[PDB]
Write a protein that binds this DNA or RNA. Sequence first.
DNA 1: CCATCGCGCTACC
DNA 2: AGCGCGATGGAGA
Length: 571
Amino acid sequence: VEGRFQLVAPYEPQGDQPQAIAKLVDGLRRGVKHQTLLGATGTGKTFTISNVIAQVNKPTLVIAHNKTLAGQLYSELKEFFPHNAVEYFVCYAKINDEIDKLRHSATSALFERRDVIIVASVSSIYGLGSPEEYRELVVSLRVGMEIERNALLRRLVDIQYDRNDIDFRRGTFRVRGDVVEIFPASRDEHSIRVEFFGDEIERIREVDALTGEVLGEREHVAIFPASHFVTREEKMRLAIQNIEQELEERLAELRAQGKLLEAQRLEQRTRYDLEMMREMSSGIENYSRHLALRPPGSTPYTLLDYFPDDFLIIVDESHVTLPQLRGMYNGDRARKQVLVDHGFRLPSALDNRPLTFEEFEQKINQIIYVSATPGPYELEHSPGVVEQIIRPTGLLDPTIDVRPTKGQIDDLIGEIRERVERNERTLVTTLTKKMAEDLTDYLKEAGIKVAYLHSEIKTLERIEIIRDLRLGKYDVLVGINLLREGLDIPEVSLVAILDADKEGALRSERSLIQTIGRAARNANGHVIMYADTITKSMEIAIQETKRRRAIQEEYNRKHGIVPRTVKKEIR
DNA sequence: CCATCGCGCTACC
DNA sequence: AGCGCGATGGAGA
Ligand SMILES: [Cl-]
Ligand SMILES: [Cl-]
């Protein structure tokens, strides 16, 4: 590889992926800042993007709008680039430990090699100190280097590695006479064995700690700090002093106001935190601004800042991701402020925050937004769109009937019964938790095996219910707004949309396309809208569905593609 | 106004 | 593992 991406896949680009790839790549090479990939559900957008990443060879940040999508994209990208550094940067016993490790693998990789793709959630790009410091404080070790064992040990301690001769673990180092064995914070199962002859480095080896294999000799190795908030001792002392002076003034302020409970609470928690500013703390991010000695109101350091300046950003499901990004500042600021009011945190804790949307914009080099339904921001900043409509599988956008509200529930049930005999599944979407609840009984009353999906349901149980649906424990799934982007269930032939004309965010153009899209994974995919009116949003959804289907049907007969329902392994 | 998300605190265990 | 709190998309009083 040598710092270049190698896209590995069992197939090549198909349908209209080639032109999509070509346009985006061209756009990047001409210095176009914002671009948008208008890719229909099931056109392999991640593969399209991977080809794009592979050709331009920039360090890439992939931003998902939740952990589930981040996880999937991470595992997909790992398969696509098995010889490159695909990393995973999400927020927070051993599950916590694994996340800390993966975060460290991600940041250190940005300073080890160019061929790096990091998948992060939009909420998880924080919790970091200066990248300049992170790099500057590396312990760089070379063979031949004049250095004492005890001095190397001291330098490792200063960057937060613990001596631990008994345990064999991440973020520690072992000592046996002349051999020091370092486990980087970024590795669970790999260590660096450093061998001294007198006060000189005779040999450096990479070791597989699980298998015990010695993997090779190194002339040079780089050990990165075991925390992202490490600073030099002088800077650290001054941080401590600033924190102490701030605490004094706020404690006096709170007491002057007769908020003695709050003052007590603040003093107690802060002192406790300061206790471990000698010993090792948790929640240290709250002091980030003082630790960096930076001005009040300063933009925080983020994952974006660890990337080089010529990096690439991919925003997955951009229409949801960007508004989530936009609203985080005000949301976080308001929660933190009440914590400051009740004396849980110092006022400087407000500087431990997400970026404003404007700050995010300042940090962009080049960006590609990815959505089947791009938001207005994406369209306004991108010069038109790179459209991608033809599926390598041949599958077509579904057919749509509009049917009236009268006896709709009886109509739906009969329609569903036909699917069960065809061994096919159905998805239904109502407006409210109430109606969904009623409807799910109606169906249980009529003997239909059905499950109900709503916000109260939890990740692990959601997963279970999707799985059971695919397995055939259920034939129908009912929900409100969770039968949407991300949902990939090829056994679904029917998507029912109740109150399809009852306008709002739930029945917007954008939402209709997304919900319709759940029918685009089956060769017999069909959508029924239960409405007495054809609304404008409805009008546009149906027309766009029709337009795509027509183009795809022509394409399919020009090239002799047979729409095949993608068999997808059940996990 | 509704469904849904994610975040720290507290009342739990 | 559960509270209250403010986000969000888009029409509504
Ligand atoms: Cl010793
Ligand atoms: Cl534009």
